[PDB]
Design an enzyme around this catalytic site. Structure first.
Site, PDB file in Angstrom:
ATOM      1  N   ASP A   1      22.184  -3.262  13.415  1.00 34.22           N
ATOM      2  CA  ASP A   1      21.830  -4.424  14.235  1.00 34.22           C
ATOM      3  C   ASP A   1      22.067  -4.202  15.719  1.00 34.22           C
ATOM      4  OD1 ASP A   1      21.022  -6.985  15.029  1.00 34.22           O
ATOM      5  OD2 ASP A   1      22.820  -8.049  14.558  1.00 34.22           O
TER       6      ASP A   1
ATOM      7  N   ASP B   1      15.948  -5.753  19.392  1.00 33.82           N
ATOM      8  CA  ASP B   1      16.853  -6.175  18.295  1.00 33.82           C
ATOM      9  C   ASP B   1      16.416  -5.745  16.885  1.00 33.82           C
ATOM     10  OD1 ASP B   1      18.577  -7.403  16.571  1.00 33.82           O
ATOM     11  OD2 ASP B   1      18.428  -9.400  17.378  1.00 33.82           O
TER      12      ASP B   1
END
Length: 377
Positions: A34, A220
């Protein structure tokens, strides 16, 4: 970096994970990668959705920090107990690091029923770490404690089962074609970048470019969608709607409120335009552009008992926390997180899905003035 190729796995829509070990002796866990967060947090309790979990009692090297953490989301959360322990990445560099680890002891809407991962690896910066920026992120600890260079790269593929590579400490030229182009990391919190122009098909939207980055624009790997400030999504959709008007779909489709379905093999990709984001370049008044396809922003939806079609979800969506460039964008490119030089590189991925009609591309240089005014203060 041959050991690290194909070290990522996943399910479409549910992120990409890497195998890691924690503690002594080593406990193997699958961990979501992440770049939109900065905490290393792992399930530590037998939640029914989990294949396995961190058992601190089995680890000689575990150290309690005697502090908790609570991370809300819009309709869920995770909460944990902070500690440190020894961490390794079997299909990563040949090192062991002492990392902060949040042992997750309560959660809501975090773990996914049917998923094969058990924690999250926040690869962003200390500024957005919880509970505050004094909790050193994993990658920071890895750089400080070893000779691993301060960079990593991600090749997310996804053809059901997706795959990819996370190259820690370097770049692997087999994963991309053409040249890398780099955009500055505006500020080291999220991986923030500045979009200076947007074309759909070739036609710019012509908005105050400040709007593109209001208040934030970010890369992201945890977020599935291309998220956009409402004002830009509004105009973005308006134009995609327009050159897609050969066929019709409900207004709910464009809001992610229903999925669109076509007979098997009959997806009309060509009715849908490309999107080009021009990114701020390395030099004054110089930009480059990345170009994705409908195959990236029109996402196959996994299983259907209520159907047997090729159904998809519109994966552009609106936001109030800035622009977010998710898997939609990253599956087109090899992305280099060059932390050492505060820049992010993009190159055409050697695994991105194409054919003979259109292709993902990275092209430059372009001349774009007043790119600094594209950033929100």
């Amino acid at each position: 970096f041959v050991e690290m190729v194909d070290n990522l796995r996943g399910k479409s829509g549910q992120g990409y994970y890497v195998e890691m070990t924690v503690g002594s002796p080593p406990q193997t866990l699958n961990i979501l990668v992440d770049t939109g967060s900065s905490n290393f947090a792992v399930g530590a309790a037998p939640h029914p959705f989990l294949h396995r979990y961190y058992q601190r009692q089995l680890s000689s090297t575990y150290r309690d920090l005697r502090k908790g953490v609570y991370v809300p989301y819009t309709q869920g959360k995770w909460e944990g107990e902070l500690g440190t322990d020894l961490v390794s990445i079997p299909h990563g560099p040949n090192v062991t690091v002492r990392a902060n680890i949040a042992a997750i002891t309560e959660s809501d809407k975090f773990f996914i029923n049917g998923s094969n991962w058990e924690g999250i690896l926040g690869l962003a910066y200390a500024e957005i770490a919880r509970p505050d920026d004094s909790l050193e992120p994993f990658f920071d600890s890895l750089v400080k404690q070893t000779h691993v260079p301060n960079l990593f790269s991600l090749q997310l593929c996804g053809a059901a089962s997706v795959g990819g590579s996370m190259i820690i400490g370097g770049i692997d030229h087999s994963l991309y074609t053409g040249s890398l182009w780099y955009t500055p990391i505006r500020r080291e919190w999220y991986y923030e970048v500045i979009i200076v122009r947007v074309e759909i098909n070739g036609q710019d939207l012509k908005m105050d470019c400040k709007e593109y980055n209001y208040d934030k624009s970010i890369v992201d790997s945890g977020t599935t969608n291309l998220r956009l400030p409402k004002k830009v999504f509004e105009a973005a959709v308006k134009s995609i709607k327009a050159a897609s008007s050969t066929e019709k779909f409900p207004d709910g489709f464009w809001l992610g409120e229903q999925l669109v379905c076509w007979q098997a093999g009959t997806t009309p990709w060509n009715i849908f335009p490309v999107i080009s984001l021009y990114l701020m370049g390395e030099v004054t008044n110089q930009s480059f552009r990345i170009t994705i396809l409908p195959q990236q922003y029109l996402r196959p939806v996994e299983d259907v008992a209520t159907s047997q079609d090729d159904c998809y979800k519109f994966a552009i969506s609106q936001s109030s926390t800035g622009t977010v460039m998710g898997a939609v964008i990253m599956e087109g490119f090899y992305v280099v997180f060059d932390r050492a030089r505060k820049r992010i590189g993009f190159a055409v991925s050697a695994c991105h899905v194409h054919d003979e009609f259109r292709t993902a591309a990275v092209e430059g240089p372009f001349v774009t003035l007043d790119m600094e005014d594209c950033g929100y203060n």
